[PDB]
Design a protein around this ligand. Structure first.
Ligand SMILES: Cc1noc(C)c1-c1ccc(C(=O)N2[C@@H](c3ccccc3Cl)SC[C@H]2C(=O)O)cc1
Lengths: 235, 340, 57, 215, 285
């Protein structure tokens, strides 16, 4: 059973330091890449940092570059994120997301539970549709998405990822590479697109399918999540 | 009485030979004289794959014509990415004496076997990032020789106990046992319809079996040494047979007799792998002289020589779309050949 | 002993059924092989080389 | 290359490091093949150190791998090329089987084929003439005339054992490049492992000179 | 001096083409799986020999001019620096190969268990540092003491005519190079080959043909070390006693250049007959 537990959250004064620990159990941590994604209260998702399997390849977001440092302990199966010079804009729920070269891509299938963190006081932009779409069971819903730069690479591969965030639950990957379906995802989800315009179609709607949909691009690094589309029951 | 039964066997053999001669009107060489010759075919290596630390004994292509699996004596199975020359996976093996490998049509499983008489099957789509073994098939006395995948639940396995068997994934039991081979069988090829297969044994005989029942529908003879490789024709009612001598024979299921013989005086080495093209016009066969020879499947005339290995070629492979040819040898090197 | 008798009768039954099967002429079988090669010749990268633009190696 | 393409390339390089580490470690282990004929003292030397049985032991900080292929029950020449390149070949021949067509003639025939095999034209052969204790109690009554008819010596163990060893010594035609080591062991013997260490030491010397280009 | 010119071209026309085949063969082995420490030393020796052969045409220009001619001053300093330092680099590299050979027969178990390509890199780098470091220190002091300072390009030693004053500093330096960069490798090479020969001769389980092809090769390699690199460094000791630069140094350099051409031949072992078969087949085509 794959499990990711995050600990090390609490009240932090501005300008202080704190360490976030994400424990990995039930899978090979050494061969799995790791990502840190934070969600501000009542806001969307944004990438923070990523560490490769061999810890020799590390990237950082522009906002948290320099102040934030990430490290991993393969024998202890624990991910570490040491933070310095915490501001009031860092108040968010941090998620540790595993990644691996799977099916020719690097999906984000499993997401951590997350931990609270409150501080008391050239990039491709992905534009989403309206963030308030009233839906009813039994209907078909299409969610649009746009990208400033074409995601179609020279190898014929389009780097698009679709995520579902249930209310009170960690985000779950549904569609990766704009055409493939993640494991455990019902077949009702379909994805299509060409270059910059993308859409996601659901054949049959269910009461458990509500939540907020997010779109992210893995073209360059610099993975910018979408604004977010929220689906709510009409009744 | 055993002597009377033995004499009756010769009478039945004579009747079969008489029937074959009656149906033998002309020869494929006589009918192919009016067709245009293929000519000279030049093949150049494109991607060379390295990383094996021992001789390569088997190599099977995937359904997508992009993923490649190779087995070596070092005890590791490497899943190669042909397009970019990358290692998708490296499956360690408990036994470093394997001589066969297989790729599932769906790509979810990879099978291997060797002198341990166990056909280990590994899962590639695990929740964890590692490749975990799924089932260890036991029950064979002789050494593993070849294994082929019909679906995700059934696998046909030929061993050195002069007996082929069909296994199950969920339960490690022999669903169907094939008996009738008097010698060691070291190769096996499956039909496109996944209903019949041909096994080449050490008694210079090729036997056609049926998966559903298990009896031998037809038997093919003509060779003078042990048959090391066999491959079904694209169409489905023919196959090419290569033995330890320096000749290759093409047999027709409907004719139940040898069609055309590919041989030359300049070759005195056996064939370790036999493969066909997508259209079936090109016959590719490996050899022990560190060379791979391309034969015309209709005219018995050589079209090209694939000489790029410093050791004996042990395995051959052609993709599903026929857009590439992979050749493995004992020099721990894999090469992909294509035209221009 | 009985092992030889059992083996001998099994081979006789195996050979008897193999002999009594339907067979077609060699020329008819040879023509079918030629027809398949000619029909699929245009879609054979090995026999007919493809340009570098469409060649993925 | 794209973002995920670089990650896939890096993953392949990580496997290359693992393959190199495993290959280097495997190159430091001496590979030995056991080819006893009809359990002629084959199991009495394994304890003194399934189709294939692998026995691993360490002597003088050197890792040894012993492979037993007596249970294959298949054609020998279909897999004898897989073991080509081993450090040495360990051969076990009983000495009390002369009285019991003959059990040593099969051993002589089996020894003749492997010793003259193409894949083993330079591999050292370590003959292990065990069961010498039973030879003392058997040669007193039953002589060697039954096994070998062209024997002119007496029934003494000193000269009869040499005759059996000699018959196993002129069975190879490539005497100028391949050497056969012979030893007389028993159940109580404890120096059998030492002899194998000295036998493989010479093979390492030849390999060492080959690597440096001297030979 | 007439025959000095002739010998240089013979080395150049034979050592250079043979080195490229040797370099191509040795480069592949290092890039081949599981390289040996001796193979790295062999590759380094070929590179040092190739460096010597590259500057050979500069030596061909000399000993054949009519005084006179065209020749720069910076080129003289750089050509002499590369040519002579490569001799000392090859001297230490050859001693390294002799060390590996001795450790093979003497300690086959330890050599097999404790061999890594890293040791070959360190052994080569010691030869690179010792040979080039001493020459670089010599070259910088020359210009630091010359009237033109703040540079290291050198303005002396274009034909090695020290008239009456610089002899007080070259001879102590020449003695130091011979005693350090030559005698230390010479002591190791002689001792290692002497022990190796007396070990393989007394080795019980070695074929008669193997011994002849092994002891003979070791003697030839040892003889080449004492003949090619002998007169060049002996003159250093003779110069100090005679208080003058010996006049026969030019002939001694030619002997050192013989090692660059002869070394590929020493490595042209049984694979050579494959080239003869390859050459015979090429002639047929
Ligand atoms: C004069 C003077 N003033 O300070 C120093 C120091 C010197 C001085 C100059 C020359 C030498 C000298 O004999 N060499 C040196 C040299 C290296 C590179 C290029 C040319 C040369 Cl000649 S190493 C080989 C040897 C030679 O080539 O035979 C010694 C000392």
């Amino acid at each position: 059973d794959v499990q990711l537990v995050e600990s090390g959250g609490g009240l932090v004064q501005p300008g202080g330091s704190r360490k976030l620990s994400c424990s990995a159990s039930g899978f090979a941590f050494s061969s799995f890449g790791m990502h840190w994604v934070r969600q501000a209260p009542e806001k969307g998702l944004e990438w923070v940092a990523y560490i490769s399997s061999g810890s020799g390849t590390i990237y950082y977001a522009d906002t948290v570059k320099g102040r934030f440092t990430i490290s991993r302990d393969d024998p202890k199966n624990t991910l570490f994120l040491q933070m310095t010079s915490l501001r009031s804009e860092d108040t968010a729920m941090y998620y540790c997301v595993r990644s691996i070269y799977y099916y020719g891509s690097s999906p984000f299938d499993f997401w951590g539970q997350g931990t609270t963190l409150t501080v008391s006081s050239s990039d491709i932009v992905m534009t989403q549709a309206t963030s308030s779409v009233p839906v009813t069971p039994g209907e078909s819903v299409s969610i649009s998405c746009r990208s400033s730069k074409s995601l179609l690479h020279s190898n014929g591969n389009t780097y698009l990822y679709w995520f579902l965030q249930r209310p009170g639950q960690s985000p779950q990957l549904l569609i990766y590479r704009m055409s493939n379906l993640a494991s455990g995802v019902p077949d009702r989800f379909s994805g299509s697109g060409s270059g910059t315009a993308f859409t996601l179609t659901i054949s049959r709607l269910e009461a458990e399918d509500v939540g907020v949909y997010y779109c992210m691009q893995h073209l360059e690094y610099p993975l910018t999540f979408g604004a977010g589309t929220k689906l709510e029951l009409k009744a | 009485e055993l002597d009377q039964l033995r004499q009756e066997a010769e009478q039945l053999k004579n009747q079969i030979r008489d029937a074959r001669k009656a149906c033998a009107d002309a020869t494929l060489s006589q009918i192919t004289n009016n067709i245009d010759p293929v000519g000279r075919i030049q093949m150049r290596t494109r991607r060379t794959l390295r990383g094996h630390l021992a001789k390569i004994y088997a190599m099977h292509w995937g359904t997508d014509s992009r993923l490649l699996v190779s087995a070596s004596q070092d005890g590791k199975l490497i899943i190669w990415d042909s397009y970019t020359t990358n290692k998708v996976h490296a499956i360690p093996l408990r036994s470093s004496w394997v001589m066969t490998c297989a790729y599932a049509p769906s790509g979810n499983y990879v099978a291997c076997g060797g002198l341990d008489n166990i056909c280990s099957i590994y899962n590639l789509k695990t929740r964890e990032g590692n490749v975990r073994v799924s089932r260890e098939l036991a029950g064979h006395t002789g050494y593993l020789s070849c294994c082929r995948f019909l679906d995700d639940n059934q696998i046909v396995t030929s061993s050195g106990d002069t007996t082929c068997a069909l296994w199950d994934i969920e339960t490690g039991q022999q669903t169907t046992t094939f008996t009738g081979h008097t010698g060691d069988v070291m190769s096996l090829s499956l039909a496109p319809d996944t209903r019949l297969f041909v096994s080449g044994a050490c008694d210079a005989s090729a036997k056609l079996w049926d998966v559903r029942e298990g009896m031998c529908r037809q038997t093919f003879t003509g060779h003078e040494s042990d048959i090391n490789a066999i491959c079904f024709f694209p169409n489905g009612n023919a196959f090419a047979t290569g033995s330890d001598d320096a000749t290759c024979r093409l047999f027709d299921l409907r004719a139940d007799q040898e069609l055309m013989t590919y041989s030359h005086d300049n070759i005195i080495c056996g064939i370790t792998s036999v493969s066909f093209s997508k259209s079936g016009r090109l016959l590719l066969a490996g050899y022990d002289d560190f060379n791979c020879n391309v034969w015309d499947a209709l005219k018995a005339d050589r079209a090209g020589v694939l000489a790029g290995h410093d050791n004996r070629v042990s395995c051959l492979g052609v993709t599903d779309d026929g857009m590439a040819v992979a050749t493995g040898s004992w020099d721990s090197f894999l090469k992909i050949w294509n035209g221009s | 002993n009985t092992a030889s008798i059992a083996q001998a009768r099994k081979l006789v039954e195996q050979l008897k059924m193999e002999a009594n099967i339907d067979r077609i002429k060699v020329s008819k079988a040879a023509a079918d092989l030629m027809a398949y090669c000619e029909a699929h010749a245009k879609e054979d990268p090995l026999l007919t080389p493809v340009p570098a633009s469409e060649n993925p190696f | 290359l794209s973002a995920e393409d670089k990650a896939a390339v890096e993953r392949s390089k990580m496997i290359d490091r693992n393959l190199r580490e495993d290959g280097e470690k495997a190159a430091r282990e001496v590979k030995l093949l056991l080819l006893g004929a009809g359990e002629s003292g084959k199991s009495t030397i394994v304890k003194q150190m399934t189709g294939i049985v692998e026995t691993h032991f360490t002597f003088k900080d050197l890792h040894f791998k012993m492979f037993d292929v007596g249970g294959q029950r298949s054609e020998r020449k279909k897999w004898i090329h897989c073991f080509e390149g081993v450090t040495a070949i360990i051969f076990c021949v009983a000495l009390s089987d002369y009285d019991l067509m003959n059990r040593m003639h099969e051993s002589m025939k089996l020894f003749d084929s492997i010793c003259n095999n193409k894949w083993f034209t330079d591999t050292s052969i370590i003959l292990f003439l065990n069961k010498k204790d039973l030879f003392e109690e058997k040669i007193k009554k039953s002589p060697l005339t039954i096994c070998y008819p062209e024997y002119a010596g007496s029934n003494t163990y000193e000269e009869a054992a040499a005759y059996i060893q000699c018959q196993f010594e002129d069975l190879n035609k490539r005497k100028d490049t391949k050497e056969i080591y012979t030893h007389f062991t028993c159940a109580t013997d404890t120096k059998n492992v030492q002899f194998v260490f000295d036998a493989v030491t010479d093979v390492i010397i030849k390999n060492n000179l080959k690597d440096c280009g001297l030979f | 001096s007439s025959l000095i010119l002739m010998a240089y071209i013979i080395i150049f026309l034979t050592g250079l083409p043979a080195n490229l085949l040797a370099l191509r063969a040795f480069v592949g082995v290092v890039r081949q799986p599981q390289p040996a420490p001796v193979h790295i030393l062999l590759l380094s020796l070929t590179l040092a020999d190739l460096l010597l052969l590259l500057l050979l045409p500069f030596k061909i220009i000399e000993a054949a001019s009519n005084f006179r001619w065209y020749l720069p001053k910076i080129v003289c300093a750089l050509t002499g620096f590369g040519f002579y330092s490569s001799i000392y680099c090859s001297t230490w590299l050859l001693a390294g190969i002799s060390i590996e050979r001795y450790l093979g027969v003497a300690f086959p178990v330890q050599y097999k268990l404790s061999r890594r390509p890293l040791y070959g890199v360190i052994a080569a780098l010691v030869a690179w540092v010792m040979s080039f470091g001493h020459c670089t220190i010599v070259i910088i002091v020359q210009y630091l003491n010359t009237t033109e300072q703040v540079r290291n390009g050198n303005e002396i030693t274009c034909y090695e005519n020290f008239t009456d004053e610089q002899l007080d500093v070259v001879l102590p330096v020449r003695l130091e190079l011979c005693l350090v960069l030559f005698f230390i490798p010479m002591a190791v090479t002689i001792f290692c080959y002497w022990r190796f020969v007396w070990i393989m001769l007394t080795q019980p389980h070695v074929g008669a043909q193997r011994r002849r092809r092994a002891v003979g090769l070791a003697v030839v390699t040892l003889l080449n070390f004492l003949v090619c690199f002998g007169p060049y460094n002996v003159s250093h000791l003779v110069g100090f006693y005679q208080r003058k630069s010996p006049w026969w140094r030019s002939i001694a350099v030619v002997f050192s250049s013989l090692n660059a051409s002869l070394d590929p031949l020493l490595f042209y072992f049984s694979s050579s007959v494959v080239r003869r078969a390859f050459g015979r087949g090429l002639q047929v085509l």
